[PDB]
Design a protein around this nucleic acid. Sequence first.
DNA 1: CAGCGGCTCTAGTCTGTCCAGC
DNA 2: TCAGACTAGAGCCGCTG
RNA 3: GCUG
Lengths: 97, 130, 443, 86, 44, 512, 166
Amino acid sequence: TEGRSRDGGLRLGEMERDCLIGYGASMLLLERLMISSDAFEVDVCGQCGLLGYSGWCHYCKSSCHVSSLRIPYACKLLFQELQSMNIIPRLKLSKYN
Amino acid sequence: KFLQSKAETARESKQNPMIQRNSSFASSHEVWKYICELGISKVELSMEDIETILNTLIYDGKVEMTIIAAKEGTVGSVDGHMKLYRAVNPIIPPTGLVRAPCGLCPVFDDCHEGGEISPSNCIYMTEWLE
Amino acid sequence: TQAEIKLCSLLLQEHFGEIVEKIGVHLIRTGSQPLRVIAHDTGTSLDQVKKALCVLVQHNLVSYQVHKRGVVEYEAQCSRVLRMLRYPRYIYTTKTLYSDTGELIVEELLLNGKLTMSAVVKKVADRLTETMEDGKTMDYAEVSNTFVRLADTHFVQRCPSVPTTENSDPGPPPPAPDDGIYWQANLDRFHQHFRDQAIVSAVANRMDQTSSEIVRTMLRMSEITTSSSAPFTQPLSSNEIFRSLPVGYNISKQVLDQYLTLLADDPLEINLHKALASLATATLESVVQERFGSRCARIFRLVLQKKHIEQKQVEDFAMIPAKEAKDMLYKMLSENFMSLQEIPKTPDHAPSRTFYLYTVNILSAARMLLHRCYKSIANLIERRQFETKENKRLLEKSQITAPERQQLETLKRNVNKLDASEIQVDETIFLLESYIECTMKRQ
Amino acid sequence: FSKGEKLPDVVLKPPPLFPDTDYKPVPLKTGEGEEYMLALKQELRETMKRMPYFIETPEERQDIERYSDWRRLPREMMPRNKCKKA
Amino acid sequence: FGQKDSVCGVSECIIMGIPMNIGTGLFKLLHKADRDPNPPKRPL
Amino acid sequence: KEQFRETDVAKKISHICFGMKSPEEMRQQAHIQVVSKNLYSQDNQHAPLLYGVLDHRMGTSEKDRPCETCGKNLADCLGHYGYIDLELPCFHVGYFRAVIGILQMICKTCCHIMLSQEEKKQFLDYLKRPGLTYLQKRGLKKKISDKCRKKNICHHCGAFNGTVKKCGLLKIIHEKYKTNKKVVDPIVSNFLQSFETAIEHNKEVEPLLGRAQENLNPLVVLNLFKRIPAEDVPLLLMNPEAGKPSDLILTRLLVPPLCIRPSVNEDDLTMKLTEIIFLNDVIKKHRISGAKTQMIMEDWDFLQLQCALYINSELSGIPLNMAPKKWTRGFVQRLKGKQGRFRGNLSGKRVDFSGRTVISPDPNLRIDEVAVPVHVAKILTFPEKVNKANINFLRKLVQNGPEVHPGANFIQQRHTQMKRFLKYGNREKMAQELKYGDIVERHLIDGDVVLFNRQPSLHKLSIMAHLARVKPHRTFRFNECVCTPYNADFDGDEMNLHLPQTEEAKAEALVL
Amino acid sequence: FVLVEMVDTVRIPPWQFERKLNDSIAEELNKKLANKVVYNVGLCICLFDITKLEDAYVFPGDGASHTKVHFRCVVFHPFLDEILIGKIKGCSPEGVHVSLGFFDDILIPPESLQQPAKFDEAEQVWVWEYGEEIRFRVVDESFVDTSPYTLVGSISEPGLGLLSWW
DNA sequence: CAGCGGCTCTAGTCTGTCCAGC
DNA sequence: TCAGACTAGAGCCGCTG
RNA sequence: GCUG
Ligand code: SF4
Ligand SMILES: [Zn+2]
Ligand SMILES: [Zn+2]
Ligand SMILES: [Zn+2]
């Protein structure tokens, strides 16, 4: 939330982001701007590249290609605002190796 | 003015002399009637209870211009004021038919594969196959 | 034309195989593509692509030519692949115009693609003798007589000279003496002859029986002297019409001359441009008759009368009420038959304008219904694709309980109702495609 | 609220329908050939086989398929009844 | 255009929550376990 | 007995491929069809309707009422889509400028692309080369359009192909029948040759026959785009596995899950969807009523405008008799802007384990140290994992508990994710039951690496890591030698503090 | 029985860094692939050998060590030509149930092919007369997950004669 | 003598304008 | 509020045939 | 609106 009245918390702006890049601090930038804000998991079907739910893909009517991806929630939100605009972000996922 | 009228009752009455067609033999030209159709329109058609016994050519010709769109004869010489060649001929259908049950359904057009309206299980071909 | 490509995926799947479809249908989707590029994009091994193109060049579906790079780019003609749908109809009119021998001539010419004379007469000497009485052997000389008899009326034309490029290999295409020269069938001659049946049925079922026969004998004596690209037939005199009449007729010259000036002056109009243009609208009108009743078909013929005079007369010129009529217009609009309001000239205002007038455009309503009929046969074959794999248990039992046999006769009622219905929509394709080819310049 | 009830309909029934199996008599001739050539096009030389089945099978063994009058006289006539182009 | 986006870049790594390549992300760490790769096989 | 299954398929994102859904893939994702305009039932029970928007088959946005599709709460649920059927097609406002581009490249009469065979081969060769950049593809598309825009007759059908251009907000016009000082072409003359009856009843039609031109519209361009050959689709630079020309015009529309648009002020995004549903019902009623085409066109224009406003509320060319009285967030307005998802929620975001206070000097601290007040230190906790080196240390911290400063607020068991709030219970029992692998959320103590930052940052030295030391007074305090990097001046200045919650984040903070 | 070469990404948690990898992977992989039928593969049992073990990464999260492991594991998969020897752990009237000795009680023979004195009449009659042998005949496995058994067999008994026991 | 074409020029339009707190 | 560097148009004249 |  936004501030002191609402026990809101503090903002890591676009300028503080530019500072941390210049230190090469890749994991701290991941901790601050993902883990301690909006960490989430989505089911992604590797066949159609769309998001699914509960390990089920309604588009394919199958259960075998679905996988879990660690994603910021604001990006999941973006990936559902864009589909309603009919801009489809079809993902492709490799293994983490 | 006559909006409270069913000309669909009168479309068969201006059709049934053109279905029978005595002397279909080709002994001559068979230049065929439009004036006798105006003649049968004025005095008496097949029987029907009609409120508009007044006979104007401007209110009676209009049933023809619908029935040309129901595949009946074109106009030959209506450029004359009352009486000229006026050739006519009832057109029998120039083709057979060409469709199928799947040509009828608009919403069933959507499908493209096994989906919610997939044709591997449609109701319409299941109905047609008995 | 994605539904067209839906059929070429379906037509090759049932006839030859699946990879000859896949490499086939990909070549329809990506065009002028070399041998290595096709095997890399479809994910197919190069040994199977060489075989699949070998079958595809045999049945004349994929044509090869090199221009600049010294590497041959194969190319598949799309509209040839759909002519496989008409294949049993191509058999039948060689039975009405030739015997059982020549009907089998166009059959194995359509089946095995490229044939020499030395093979195809040797094959029908097997098939026709095995169905005739042993000891009463069919003599092959009559086959060679009817073989050329097809060619003098030009129903069978020869293959264009082979490029013989280095990349192309001569040994693989022939399937294993004399060499000879190869040919396919002249199916283009059929599309004249199928049109010859189309116009003679258009006149006989409209004008009179004696009117159609003089159209037939006009067109039967104008076969070699024209082509399919002829805008109309070669002009004839009426004196050779009396010479070319069949012996069944006995009509005097002057009475048929009255019918000759009768048949020359019609709304139908031999103008081959106007003939397919008038036959296509009846195919349109038989679809609205099929679908929206005679009442909406009555206003569908009304817009073919007046080009841009609409909605201030269509409530009057058919006398049907304003409520019942305006749902027929918008259903003819929403299904793209009524075309559109190409007359509005007031600037950028849906509310305030010079009143939008409906107008049928004959070709946009043609190309849609052809695209619809391409979609239609996709739903036909896929059902016959559906009902086949389940019932395979009881086909070999004859080769059995009461519901087991009853499923078979409801299958065989279904498949024969499907397969007959693939051909009845097929005659709508050619009747409209020949109209499509007649209005297409530079092709 | 006037339509807020359910999926419009499972299907929409058109009061007018298809005519028949149109051209009933004569397509008995074409209709058997539809099924005749399909019996012979599948059983032809111009087809492919599932060699992916045999590379899938590591169970190969012996005794299984996986392991295993034209009465005519000579003549020669070559006609150019056809085109002289392309 | 149907464009596919490489998630390699810095800004999309912060959006997607994956560690950026530059800085401490450029290299990988292996554990120096006491292991024998390609070990002796059991004969058939 | 049991079949093998992989326990936890964690994967890594390799790429995002953008694209568009066909109208019949939308129906395969969506769980329900939405048909009802009313948000809520009229009666006092305050339920939403079964087949309208706010239906809980599309998820939930309140803990009071669970989702219907998966029976799970707000915290557990990803959300699910519905769809609206549209009775007439509409332009998608994001794709509209691309719709015109295709119609400038394709022949309007047979849907083939207007290029010479050699030109098509050259463009295909350019597409074939590997390593093509996105900029190169955009440049190639411009070249293909320019060559097409210079041809006026199709090589394939022969029909004339005049200019396609915009003619007002979401309307397209094509000069298929242009007029010239030279003798008029037969096709244009035939088009206007004899509308005598129309001329008799319409005065405007007779004077300027040339002005009337082909009004392209969604019912036509959807029928063209179904007929474009799939061989010619790659030359429009559309990737044929991400979308088709047919998908641009939309006859269907997805409605987002409820968690995209939460139930509380009073939600108006649902009202925008309701207006589209209401218009579709009204248009169907007008067709049944046999209303005039101009009335149908106006209703259709309103439906196109509402769909365009729903995707983007910032359109320039809206007529005065159609302009919104109030401003509303479209999808584009919540993506763009400083408060938009890209900058407000993604590039810069609010973080937890953070604090802020007035700063004041303390020269008796070292330059690497910062004084943290006890009130912040009791709140800002660090999760210390229990192991052999710290077990006896963390026990004493667990015993002190939340109210004494070297203490702990929470304890968490090895394979469990709920947290025991250590204010209750007997802490001397919970200290004895510490196991290795438990997490003790101890208070911030002396020697924690803590980030320290003034609000405007012009360089990297504006945020640095300091070793915390706890002191009683409320301000943050540091040695005045470090005032020059922060540009701090102790005149009621405030500074931010962040406590990195991870061992890897301590090391990167401390060393770098 | 047949060897099956398999590849897995085996995660060793960091409190096992004392033990050697090739042993401590093997203790994990036995807990991953024992008593579990793999679809189209067969019933995994244990670990034969680790044929190739590649280098131990450690990822930006876990702090554990993830070694991609090539190995060979012995599995149970009859070859459609095996005359096995089991025990009747059950008799149903539609067909007998044989079980391989403490291996898997999931082999269910249909019984239509032995000598024309065949019925199981629910009073546990094995066969109307004239260790138990078995001919495993078909492979049949069904993948279980379907919404938000599995190697069953069909087992025959032809005219073997069975000289020792009838 | 006439027609492409690029130049050249209006001018039209949409696109930004620090970080954060209360 | 203040550009601002894109995107079509209107031409223009003069060779380009 | 003001503080930063
Ligand atoms: S079968 Fe397939 S195509 Fe034919 S109607 Fe039903 S859905 Fe439409
Ligand atoms: Zn999927
Ligand atoms: Zn849910
Ligand atoms: Zn064209």
